[model samples]
Target: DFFSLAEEAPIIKLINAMLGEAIKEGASDIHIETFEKTLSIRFRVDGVLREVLAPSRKLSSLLVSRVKVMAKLDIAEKRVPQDGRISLAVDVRVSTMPSSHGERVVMRLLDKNATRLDLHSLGMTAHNHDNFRRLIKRPHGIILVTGPTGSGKSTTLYAGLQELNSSERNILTVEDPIEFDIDGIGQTQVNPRVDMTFARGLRAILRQDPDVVMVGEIRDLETAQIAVQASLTGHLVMSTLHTNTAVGAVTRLRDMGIEPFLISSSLLGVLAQRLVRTLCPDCKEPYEADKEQRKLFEPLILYRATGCPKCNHKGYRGRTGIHELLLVDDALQELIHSEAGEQAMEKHIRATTPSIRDDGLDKVRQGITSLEEVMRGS
Candidate 1:
């Protein structure tokens, strides 16, 4: 066997130890790579990959198989990529996606044991947090959260659902793969194999008397139409789209053939976001900002990393969300209904919403993230 019991024991122990550390560090994803001498360990934090350590490559390979075995996957079939999930009693869910180069594992540390976060605590600046709470309290409309993958979009969506709780309201959701278990809400998993498309799922959920419908994604025309329709029908519909900025969500919906009239009438708000690393209390550093860096953040405050023993010199501990929220007003709605082209929509949003660059800069001002990260992501 490629992973014989006797030979694999040590490697397994090493891997589990690394995983334990990653969990303790609150890392979202872990990566393993093969090199001549050692296996490289990296973490996907705040949308960027940062190296953690390097161990023997042989040990890394063994650890890969050990993870497969833990997830009850076929360790022998490593030639092709594989995906599986494992849940622990502590409510931690580890999803493994194995590739030839190595294994890309995402361990979702569900906060089941922790107190549910208030809307303000979900990385919202005080002002924005208040605005967000107001937006969610609205009776019925479409709210779209736009961000790249792993930008905490799912967490925001779940938080919104949690906030909108009511025994009088029927909340239903159609997720590609329901990531979390929220009590008192009806959640459905999308299975293309079973013909459970997002649009179909929305239609099915509507028939069940849903007062609120959360569509995981609006990738196609049918799903877009369903979301718009649901919003018009007096059901609060929440969904997400893969877009860089809030304005992009507008054009994306148009590309899906959602008419401007429907979009203007049904759309409520758009929230664009990114995740950035926080200074590690254990090993962070402080330093003066360079001239070039100062110019980049001319209008915002700047902070530099000064290596300290606590943060391991990385200058980062955890991550925080940087967001741009767009609340559709009468003026914006009229512009949408005008069927202005994508460029016009982009321009209109640029003029209407608070400057996107400024929003990122604001986070930097508070020392929550770096200017380099803002530039890279924006």
Candidate 2:
């Protein structure tokens, strides 16, 4: 009868109501911060936070307990950090980790009802997407995604995994925290606290007979070495790195002490990306583009944001990814094997394919994003 108490009933009702609203708004994260008397509900969308509602602090705490219960975490352990995950019937999954201030929740909204996107819908330019499709079709190599945190690297990697013929291949993933669940794919989460390092996970995964291996991030020399070795040993390895551009990924990998020759042999391509807010179609307000802006993006096209009702008068709706893809070729392989400096490698990449900045500029030219967004570094 405790769960049926009126106070508990309304709190549960409010929490569900808020979650449902957040989902409908296309929110990737929700934050409940302590304020005066009420809890502030912030939704992260389009790489920005927009407040949806504010409820009482009491309600917030109750909702936090409710969430912990749903995730099966120790509700009494509020003083210490706790991590747990929950899965919804429609494939909507969420990961909950307690923070110093309160419980932090990240809901990975997977639309079971939505159609799966081909390479095109992943926000890749047609040319880049075509090359990406071809590169993944290869039997064995390493494909790396590089970007700062929350750049949608995992999403793109997962999308690529969806494209593979899983029945004919064995797909394995080593993640620090497994974020999403894909059926017919093997996923492993690293538990450094328990000594399950990325290197250790990969070693175990290799013995599992995988055709495709995905490492969440190559953070250390050991992990990097293992991933490169996995790629060289006839397994197609996919991983993420923290870098700004497609070409920079190679240098970053080399910095980790992975021999250039081994990298050249195993590397297939690098996909670099940044996420930007898309103009709101309903409330966007457009103005004329300036000549100075035009000169800055001389080679590319440009579009302006117009506030619209559909976009809540913000001139931006949701976020979209701007990506640059570099496919390794024989010439680039030769350059890597030569132990070329960053400049030399970059020059070779430029000669081989378009750079990330150029790719962003292309989006600007197409009016998909703004120059300010393009010029800013990831």
Candidate 3:
């Protein structure tokens, strides 16, 4: 009776109600925090949380308990942290960590096609767009996308995958969780409990004759090795790398023990990016540039952080990406082949690809974002 009341009866409807509102508000995550005597519900919209509801302790317990139940995490065993998923038309990845008062639950909404924009709309300059198109057309090689977490890297991959998704080609993907269902592609969710790691998943996918393969991340050496091998074997492979710059992606792989020769040959390109909040167009006001600011930006022609009722006094709304695109040209390939130094690599990258900051400057030039926001993203 207690379980049903606390986690079953009203929670399904209540949480759904909250989720519906969050989705309508374009929130990426849902946060439910419990303190010793208070509880709060907040929605993370555009990478910022806005508090929504405050429930009594009795109701808050039921609310938190219900999500755990839906996610199939331990309800009785609350001492340890856990991860689970809740499926209701869409998927919500749930994780709970122990806190001073109670479990702090953070839920991430996973939708593969939600932010599905054409490659052109993904904040790529025309030059990089043409280069990326060429890179994607390659029959065999690794196209590594590098960025920090929550940097729209996955969305970029998913959109690219969507372009490649077709009935004629066999596309296989192995993700930590199959974020969203593509119309006609094969997707596998990795489960380490039974030893279904990324390396093993890609190995199994290879036997099935996949034309294009996607790995959520090349976290371990085994996965990286197999991915490069897969690329060499005539399968187009795409994956993400954890690095700050496109050039660093190479160093990261080498640091991960992937040889430079293999990297120079088997890699197609690297796309690095960051997310910056857009300016509130309705209330943006121009301001005089300070002495320090005049060094990089124009004087008296920049915008200020002015908020209106629409942006809720945050001076910004929505978000856009600042990107660095690196294509493996013959010149750059030679540098990689020779195990060049950082300066050589840096020069090649700067010549070939615009830095994320430069791309952010483009956004600032268009008045889509502000200088302060762009530098903050750095």
Top candidate (lDDT): 3
Residue 49 accuracy (lDDT) in model 3? 75
lDDT of each: 0.74, 0.75, 0.82
Q: State model 1's lDDT.
A: 0.74
Q: List the residue pairs that clash in candidate 3.
A: none
TM-score of each: 0.74, 0.74, 0.82
Task: Report the C-alpha displacement of residue 229, candidate 2, in angstroms.
Answer: 1.1
Q: For candidate 1, write residues 131-193 as lDDT tens digits.
A: 888888788999999889878788788888988878978899999778767889999999989
Give per-model CA RMSD. Answer: 5.9, 5.5, 4.4
Question: Which candidate leads the pack in TM-score?
Answer: 3
Q: How would you encode candidate 3's per-residue C-alpha lDDT over 1-378 as one tens digit per residue?
A: 322332446677778777777777777799889877888888888667777776776676677688898888788877889998776755688988888878888889866455667677787778777777778767889998889987888878887887778787889999987767777889999998989988899899999999899999999999999999999999999999879888889888888988889999998888988888888888988877778776775245778768876686478877777788888878888898888966898797775567888899877867788998988867
Model 2 CA lDDT for position 40: 70
lDDT of 3 at 205: 94
Estimate the lDDT of model 3: 0.82
* lDDT of candidate 2 over 201-302, digit per residue (tens): 999999999999999999999999998888888999899998977778888888889888998888999988888777555544345566776665524335
